Amino acid sequence: FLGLTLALSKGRILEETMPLLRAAGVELLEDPEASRKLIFPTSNPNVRVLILRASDVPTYVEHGAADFGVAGKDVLLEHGANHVYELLDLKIAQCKLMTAGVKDAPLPNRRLRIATKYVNVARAYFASQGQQVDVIKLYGSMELAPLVGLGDLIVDVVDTGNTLRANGLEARDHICDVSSRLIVNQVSYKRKFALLEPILDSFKNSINS
Amino acid sequence: FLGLTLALSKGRILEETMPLLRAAGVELLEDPEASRKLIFPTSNPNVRVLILRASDVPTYVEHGAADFGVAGKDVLLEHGANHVYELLDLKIAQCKLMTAGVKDAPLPNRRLRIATKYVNVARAYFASQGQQVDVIKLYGSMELAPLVGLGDLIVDVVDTGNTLRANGLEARDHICDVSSRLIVNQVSYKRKFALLEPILDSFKNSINS
Numbered sequence: 001f002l003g004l005t006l007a008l009s010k011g012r013i014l015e016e017t018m019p020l021l022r023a024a025g026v027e028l029l030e031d032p033e034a035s036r037k038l039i040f041p042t043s044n045p046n047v048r049v050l051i052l053r054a055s056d057v058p059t060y061v062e063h064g065a066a067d068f069g070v071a072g073k074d075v076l077l078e079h080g081a082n083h084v085y086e087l088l089d090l091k092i093a094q095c096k097l098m099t100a101g102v103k104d105a106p107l108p109n110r111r112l113r114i115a116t117k118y119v120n121v122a123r124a125y126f127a128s129q130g131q132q133v134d135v136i137k138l139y140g141s142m143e144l145a146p147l148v149g150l151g152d153l154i155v156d157v158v159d160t161g162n163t164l165r166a167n168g169l170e171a172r173d174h175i176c177d178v179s180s181r182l183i184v185n186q187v188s189y190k191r192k193f194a195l196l197e198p199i200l201d202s203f204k205n206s207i208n209s
Numbered sequence: 210f211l212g213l214t215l216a217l218s219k220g221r222i223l224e225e226t227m228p229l230l231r232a233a234g235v236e237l238l239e240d241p242e243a244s245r246k247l248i249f250p251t252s253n254p255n256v257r258v259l260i261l262r263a264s265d266v267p268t269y270v271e272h273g274a275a276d277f278g279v280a281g282k283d284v285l286l287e288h289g290a291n292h293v294y295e296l297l298d299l300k301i302a303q304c305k306l307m308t309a310g311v312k313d314a315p316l317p318n319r320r321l322r323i324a325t326k327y328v329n330v331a332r333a334y335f336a337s338q339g340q341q342v343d344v345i346k347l348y349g350s351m352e353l354a355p356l357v358g359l360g361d362l363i364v365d366v367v368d369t370g371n372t373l374r375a376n377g378l379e380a381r382d383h384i385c386d387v388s389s390r391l392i393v394n395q396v397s398y399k400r401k402f403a404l405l406e407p408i409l410d411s412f413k414n415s416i417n418s
């Protein structure tokens with residue numbers, strides 16, 4: 001396949017990327033949410049789409065199994081973005097990386113235990129606050145961890161805050177704002193630039209308005 | 210909560226554990242699949258259930274946020290089971306850890322790249338075959354990796370083989386048989402044995418037939 005392969009994740013990133021793609025002359029021919037298929041053609045015969053877990057987008061792009069992709073800044077920070085080029089902030093799937101714990105719970109006077117998927121981000125954030133922390137790596141449902149005493153705080157993405165509030169948790173600290181970024185393979189950028197450039201320019205134009 | 214906290218995952222493990230629980234006098238009061246809730250009471254007031262990602266069951270059990278749980282041998286091998294007690298093979302959610310690649314694809318003559326969630330299992334298996342391999346850590350959809358050239362083989366769980374066959378892949382090697390196991394926290398076993406013992410005996414009886 002000589003064309004471009006675009007890596008996306010289902011749900012938020014796919015929903016909010018599709019208008020950008022449509023403006024660029026690229027439309028999916030079916031709904032990937034309703035399929036077991038993983039490779040999808042588009043209305044442009046030079047572009048196909050891989051549907052991945054969000055955590056795997058940078059990996060496929062890094063290794064060149066996709067030429068480019070859309071990934072959340074939270075994922076890029078955690079995975080490490082040293083072997084891809086971040087080209088555009090698409091301003092989509094907006095949220096915050098935050099810390100949170102049980103509402104009005106005092107912090108214990110000892111080395112903190114942080115339950116989180118974002119172990120690198122958690123360590124780096126707490127390092128900036130002067131704390132060397134223990135991390136408990138989890139893969140989902142971070143909001144449960146404080147309720148059953150697994151760790152003293154969590155680090156997770158927060159949008160509306162409804163998940164925190166539903167579970168008797170409150171956000172303690174804002175770490176950083178998060179949005180989805182367009183990343184490119186470092187070799188694809190050099191070899192397939194003529195194919196990438198119109199789509200990059202289209203996206204850039206669309207995000208201005 | 211002085212009673213027992215049982216860690217389970219949704220889908221396969223929950224479906225096949227429920228009959229074991231029912232025989233032991235423990236029934237959920239609603240369907241966790243249809244809820245955002247994560248802590249669930251049962252018909253026994255001394256037992257509650259946490260609903261977790263499969264990868265997190267050993268972690269909650271290890272740290273004592275759950276007293277016991279049901280986890281697949283594939284997860285236990287990958288996570289490491291040195292800080293829990295494996296008490297019973299429940300013979301449920303049966304499958305195999307296998308290697309697979311594109312059907313009739315020759316292996317390249319160089320260090321192999323293995324795309325997988327099971328990075329420790331992949332390294333240990335290939336070590337037994339005399340190969341020091343590179344691993345590409347993924348979080349899902351392993352069946353895609355060989356189709357887009359991300360790695361030369363995968364390591365994944367296989368049940369019917371339909372996923373492999375649908376994607377033009379075939380299993381190369383059988384690594385080991387996999388089934389779900391009852392794991393217990395090493396302190397809970399010592400302190401809550403009177404509560405655990407009847408349920409352990411019930412499960413053991415049920416799996417004999």
Ligand SMILES: N=c1c2ncn([C@@H]3O[C@H](COP(=O)(O)OP(=O)(O)OP(=O)(O)O)[C@@H](O)[C@H]3O)c2ncn1[C@@H]1O[C@H](COP(=O)(O)O)[C@@H](O)[C@H]1O
Binds near residue numbers: 095160178179
């Ligand atoms: N609210 C978000 C959210 N908002 C924006 N995003 C971005 O969307 C990207 C892709 O979302 P995914 O669902 O693929 O990512 P994910 O849910 O973190 O991971 P998966 O377990 O679903 O694979 C993420 O990597 C983020 O950059 C969010 N990602 C996750 N959430 C979750 O939704 C819940 C919080 O929502 P509020 O209750 O509105 O705060 C929490 O569980 C959050 O973790």
Ligand SMILES: N=c1c2ncn([C@@H]3O[C@H](COP(=O)(O)OP(=O)(O)OP(=O)(O)O)[C@@H](O)[C@H]3O)c2ncn1[C@@H]1O[C@H](COP(=O)(O)O)[C@@H](O)[C@H]1O
Binds near residue numbers: 220264284368369371
């Ligand atoms: N077929 C199974 C399967 N059979 C049994 N099990 C066991 O069930 C346990 C719990 O299943 P989960 O769905 O929670 O685990 P998971 O799907 O590996 O992980 P999640 O991404 O869903 O969190 C696993 O840890 C295994 O021990 C299986 N776990 C996963 N699969 C998947 O189903 C597909 C293959 O099915 P066949 O096409 O029938 O081979 C592949 O994607 C497999 O990875």
Ligand SMILES: [Mg+2]
Binds near residue numbers: 011
């Ligand atoms: Mg999600």
Ligand SMILES: [Mg+2]
Binds near residue numbers: 220
């Ligand atoms: Mg599954």
